[PDB]
Design a protein around this ligand. Structure first.
Ligand code: MG
Ligand code: MG
Ligand code: MG
Ligand code: MG
Ligand code: MG
Ligand code: MG
Ligand code: MG
Ligand code: MG
Ligand code: MG
Ligand code: MG
Ligand code: MG
Ligand code: MG
Ligand code: MG
Ligand code: MG
Ligand code: MG
Ligand code: MG
Ligand code: MG
Ligand code: MG
Ligand code: MG
Ligand code: MG
Ligand code: MG
Ligand code: MG
Ligand code: MG
Ligand code: MG
Ligand code: MG
Ligand code: MG
Ligand code: MG
Ligand code: MG
Lengths: 207, 257, 153
RNA sequence: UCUCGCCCGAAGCGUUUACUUUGAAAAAAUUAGAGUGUUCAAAGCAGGCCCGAGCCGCCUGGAUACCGCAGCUAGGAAUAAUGGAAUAGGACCGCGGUUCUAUUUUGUUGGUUUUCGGAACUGAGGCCAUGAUUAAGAGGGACGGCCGGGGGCAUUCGUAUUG
RNA sequence: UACCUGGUUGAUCCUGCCAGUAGCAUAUGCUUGUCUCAAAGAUUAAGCCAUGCAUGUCUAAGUACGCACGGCCGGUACAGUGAAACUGCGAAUGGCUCAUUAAAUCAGUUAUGGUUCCUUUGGUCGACUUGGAUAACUGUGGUAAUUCUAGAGCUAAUACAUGCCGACGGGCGCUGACCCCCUUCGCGGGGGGGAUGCGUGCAUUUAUCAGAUCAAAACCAACCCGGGCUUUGGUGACUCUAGAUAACCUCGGGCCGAUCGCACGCCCCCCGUGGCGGCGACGACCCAUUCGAACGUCUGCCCUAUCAACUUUCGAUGGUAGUCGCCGUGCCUACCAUGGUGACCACGGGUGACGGGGAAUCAGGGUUCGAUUCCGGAGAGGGAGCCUGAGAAACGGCUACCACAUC
RNA sequence: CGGAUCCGUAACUUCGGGAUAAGGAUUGGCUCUAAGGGCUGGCAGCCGACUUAGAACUGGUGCGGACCAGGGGAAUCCGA
RNA sequence: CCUGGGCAGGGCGAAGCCAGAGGAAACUCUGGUGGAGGUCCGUAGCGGUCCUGACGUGCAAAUCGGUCGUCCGACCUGGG
């Protein structure tokens, strides 16, 4: 019986409006679903007009888009930090439209190896992971093309994203509503937004 | 109320249906079709009230499912199927090809045309868009959505349509010097050459039109139907040019008898 | 600068400019929208600094419907001001008029500086921004007196 | 203004109303009102004709007027208030310097520069008949010869009453 | 019909009210021959209801082994009428009343680019038939009875599900074995082809890229021809529509016929055991129109100051993000600012106040009603919550409370 | 009832009061968060006190846990 | 009369002072600050309302236990 109506409100001045409706059907209100970080669990909601709404009660997998290089892979959701609207929902770990998700940087490493060779995040050992790092041997002139992609374009993912990849986590902003479409779809924080949310999380951990 | 309306009152009926006060309580409400309720004419009104074919409406309801009356090629099973301006009504046995043109009084005037012109039909473009795989779609005011129309069609045009094939032909642009016919408002049924359009940024523009023997009027873009091409109407219109002279000239006509 | 949690309307920030290494100007990636209607976009929306979701030149606020005019009365409300529309009312019985006015809150975009009290401002209808704000500041016309003179201190 | 195809169209466009005259504007019923012998009329939108049934037929009506106030468009400039130039930070014309952006062309692609179209700022002079309607038997203020039991403070005189 | 008359005084003139005058609409007294129309439980009691009805529906075209009737009728399932039940649509319309409601509903005018939309009308719709279950039916029961129902057997489809062939494989993105030419001792450099493998179409959810008004050269490095060539649409406007890029496509799972009827002919051919299949009822992913809803924008409402400041901890005003909702919204949440309205009557009260088109009243200007047949709103004793469904907080739908009230 | 915190407080009146009027909610433990300061250099860096507010978790509704400690209201007579 | 000694903490918040707001003026309103009083709860101190409690040949020829009134003063008290 949740009513999002405006006829029970006050006027421009603040005069109490006289009630005469009975909270009709075309002004529905459904209770909130705090989207946890458990397994994938989505229920259905009937919509006025015969449509279907996918209510995500808790989610595990997610979809996130890298910003600059225009790539997108699947990503397991790890942790919820800095809601920036309600800090209680950080501890509640509720997925909303504008929130920050820790991307596991492992599904981006295969694409970064396959297109942007001589990768990073390999613990400065240079002995481990016989991945096919140097097995394919880069026979034809696509080796020179990858040299253009690696040195002429120069592939700079400099010190902020460097330290994030060397810590094995990535800071992502959600760009979709989890309670509406059932998808925790988002993008990767880059540059000015990256240093801004990094400063906010660093201040939250410091003071 | 709740949901859509379903009845219609004779008192709340529109004026251009020629309904009575003593006959019945409920008016024939037309079904959902290509035309709105204010610019339509039911088949039960067309066959019962106007042409005097059946006295009751039950006879019309019987014959429309006895599969005689067809609109634009296909047979209508509904007794209250809505029609509109510039439609072809033919029933299958004699020469009866009624064109729904507008009278000078604003009423649906019958016009028995020959078969060679009854094969063809004009229609006004409502809007134009693009869709799946980048193809052009055209929406007609007669609820006709056609793909790959032409690239040289402005939104406010009148294109000839073939009822046998569903193909458009012989478009004409909205230009000064075209013969148009006003379909809506207080000056409907007015046939005149387009004289001057005036644009306004407030989502509505005005058009001043002129016609023969020194007369001029003005209307809005949502009520204009182009009918001609340089003082040459593609469809022959009954009772002269459809000109409203004067109520006193109508009295002089009735005295001349 | 910014003093909120996030301000980024539509434009993607990084053009991956790190190819030689340089700071450069960062005010070039700015969204620029023309409202049409024969009204000129001010240069504050061109070379400004602000980020406004409800600006008609920056946000997705479409301008439609009616165009009215009023006079600016107050400033104390944040990023939106209150206008006054003085008008007369024809009365059939007594056969003369009377003064009536209805104050409305209107969204003042931060690009319009020199918004001093007493100037004739133009407003336009938009989508409902908030509970009382429905119009949008569209053109500031009057200088609200003589700006040439100056006072002591 | 001829950039848009010696004139026109288009576009710069109103400083913003009040007031007026057209035009669209809406929904019928109702009101005024056209026509019609419902036996007149209240009504209603009907009916009128030719034909000895044999023309497997015609013609016409179901209009118009009003619809305050509110909103839109096109003229009018009389009355009623508002904008200009006073510490000039005034309007035009063509020249100095600083700075930015987009696309036409060097047969095509990549790099540098100029002219060009425009925006912003600064410096110097000319061009304006270079800029203030005169002062209401309106009002405010100043002057100076008065005016009056106007008001406040202090002082003096007068007879009478009582003791 | 632009209309007065009598009444204060011994008499006259004046202000002044009272009373006669005429409609209008409620009741009532008396009387009443014809005929055409015609309002009618509004005023008090939106108080209570016995009884009887007001919502059902089948086509040649979804499902016929009904025990009912008959076709001639022999047998290779099935033809005809067909009660009843499974299925779909409608019962969110109509009718009734005006109890609440004072910029609230409404009325004039504008728009959803900020939404949904049954049903019709158009575009789109690129394995010789698969599995459980069940109603009607038959037996079998319960209590005093309801539109009460479980238990045993079986049966059907447009019930609910599972799920296939075609169709050549085109083109593109990324890897990619291999291969051609020139130069160089080689290394290397430059230009041009290319077998495998992974992704494809429309919608859903992201992020990114390129996208229209305008005309002259001067230098350096690469290449086509005989000094010289390359481009989606609309609005007043877009974060509009449409392309391309990488991936998700959600088990409560978007679509890409595991339908039915008609009249029936023809052909390649080795039998047809295969095609040539024409018309017509169902929505099916989406896009428009049509019917309708919704919050919106400007203007307009009776009386009252013995109603002068009102709103703000249970948002009052605004901003920043988020939740919910179909969408824009203090509709809700966290933080921040202290705002917003008013003597041009704010706020609070009363209305024997539903708002209008209209009705009565005959100079003009006005005054009083409008519950009532047409539009819109509200409600089904009060008031709250909800299933189904596109559309309801429905009441001739359901659940709980109060007041009634039946067996 | 009794302490403390946050709302709200009538009749009357000498306008000071009545008033801790009356009447409601919370009170424990353990974690955090925010705010309130000092001293040095031409905004940055070092050093400490007990207060307030908000939030989460949890204990058998238990929290002034002992002790500390106003029952209240309507009136009449008399004396300020 | 002279001469000395003493009176824990809290509540109410007077004059004066500061800042802000309304108004044309007269003037009004709001938040602090201040610490006033034969002022309120209350300890020590001083008296003794009630239980007519305990004793009542008692501890005492007038005392004790609760419940008390007042406690910055018209306050209590030593010595001369
Ligand atoms: Mg710490
Ligand atoms: Mg109804
Ligand atoms: Mg003298
Ligand atoms: Mg008299
Ligand atoms: Mg009288
Ligand atoms: Mg809140
Ligand atoms: Mg009422
Ligand atoms: Mg009259
Ligand atoms: Mg009148
Ligand atoms: Mg409605
Ligand atoms: Mg409404
Ligand atoms: Mg209802
Ligand atoms: Mg009903
Ligand atoms: Mg009933
Ligand atoms: Mg009392
Ligand atoms: Mg007391
Ligand atoms: Mg007494
Ligand atoms: Mg005493
Ligand atoms: Mg005292
Ligand atoms: Mg006391
Ligand atoms: Mg006491
Ligand atoms: Mg004693
Ligand atoms: Mg004692
Ligand atoms: Mg005793
Ligand atoms: Mg004893
Ligand atoms: Mg005591
Ligand atoms: Mg005591
Ligand atoms: Mg005391």
């Amino acid at each position: 019986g949740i009513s999002r109506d405006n006829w029970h409100k006050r006027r421009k001045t603040g005069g109490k409006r006289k009630p005469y409706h009975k909270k009709r059907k075309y002004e529905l209100g459904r209770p909130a679903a705090n989207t946890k970080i458990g397994p994938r669990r989505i229920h259905t909601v009937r919509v006025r007009g015969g449509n279907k709404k996918y209510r995500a009660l808790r989610l595990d997998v997610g979809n996130f888009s890298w910003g600059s290089e225009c790539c997108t892979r699947k990503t397991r959701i790890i942790d919820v930090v800095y809601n920036a609207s309600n800090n209680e929902l950080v501890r509640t770990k509720t997925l909303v439209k504008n929130c920050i998700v820790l991307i596991d940087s492992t599904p981006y490493r295969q694409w970064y190896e396959s297109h942007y060779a001589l990768p990073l995040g390999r613990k400065k050992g240079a002995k481990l992971t016989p991945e096919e790092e140097e097995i394919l041997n880069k026979k034809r002139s696509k080796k020179i093309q990858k040299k253009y992609d690696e040195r002429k374009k120069n592939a700079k993912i400099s010190s902020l994203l460097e330290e994030q990849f060397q810590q094995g986590k990535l800071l992502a902003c959600i760009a979709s509503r989890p309670g509406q479409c059932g998808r925790a779809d988002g993008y990767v924080l880059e540059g000015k937004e990256l240093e801004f949310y990094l400063r906010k999380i660093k201040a939250r951990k410091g003071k | 109320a709740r949901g859509p309306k379903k009845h219609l009152k004779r008192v709340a009926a529109p004026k251009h249906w020629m309904l009575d006060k003593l006959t019945g309580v409920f008016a024939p409400r037309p079904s959902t079709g290509p035309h709105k309720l204010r610019e339509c004419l039911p088949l039960i009104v067309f066959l019962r009230n106007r042409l005097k074919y059946a006295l009751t409406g039950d006879e019309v309801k019987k014959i429309c499912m006895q599969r005689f009356i067809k609109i634009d090629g296909k047979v209508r099973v509904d007794v209250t199927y809505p029609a509109g301006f510039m439609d072809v009504i033919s029933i299958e046995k004699t020469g009866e090809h009624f064109r729904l043109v507008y009278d000078t009084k604003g009423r649906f005037a019958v016009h028995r045309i020959t078969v060679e012109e009854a094969k063809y039909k004009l229609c006004k473009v409502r809007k134009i868009t693009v869709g799946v795989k980048g193809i052009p779609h055209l929406v007609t005011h007669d609820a006709r959505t056609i793909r790959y129309p032409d690239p040289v069609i402005k939104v406010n045009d009148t294109v000839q349509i073939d009822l046998g094939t569903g193909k458009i032909i012989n478009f004409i642009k909205f230009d000064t010097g075209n013969l148009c016919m006003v379909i809506g408002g207080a000056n409907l049924g007015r046939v005149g050459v387009i004289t001057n359009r005036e644009r306004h940024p407030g989502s509505f523009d005005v058009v001043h039109v002129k016609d023969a023997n020194g007369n001029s009027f003005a209307t809005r873009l949502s009520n204009i139907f182009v009918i001609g091409n340089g003082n040459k109407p593609w469809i022959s219109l009954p009772r002269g040019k459809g000109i409203r002279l004067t109520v006193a000239e109508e009295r002089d006509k009735r005295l001349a008898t | 600068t910014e003093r909120a949690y996030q301000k980024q309307p539509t434009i993607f920030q990084n053009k991956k400019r790190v190819l030689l290494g340089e700071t450069g100007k960062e005010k070039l990636p700015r969204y620029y929208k023309n409202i049409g209607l024969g009204f000129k976009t001010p240069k504050e929306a061109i070379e400004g600094t602000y980020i406004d979701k409800k600006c008609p030149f920056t946000g997705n606020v479409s301008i439609r419907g009616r165009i009215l005019s009023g006079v600016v009365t107050k400033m104390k409300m944040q990023r939106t001001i209150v206008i006054r529309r003085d008008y007369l009312h024809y009365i059939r019985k007594y056969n003369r008029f009377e003064k009536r006015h209805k104050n409305m809150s209107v969204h003042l975009s931060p690009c319009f500086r020199d918004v001093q009290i007493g100037d004739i401002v133009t407003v336009g209808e938009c989508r409902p921004l908030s509970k009382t704000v429905r119009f949008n500041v569209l053109k500031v016309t009057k200088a609200a007196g003589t700006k040439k003179q100056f006072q002591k201190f």
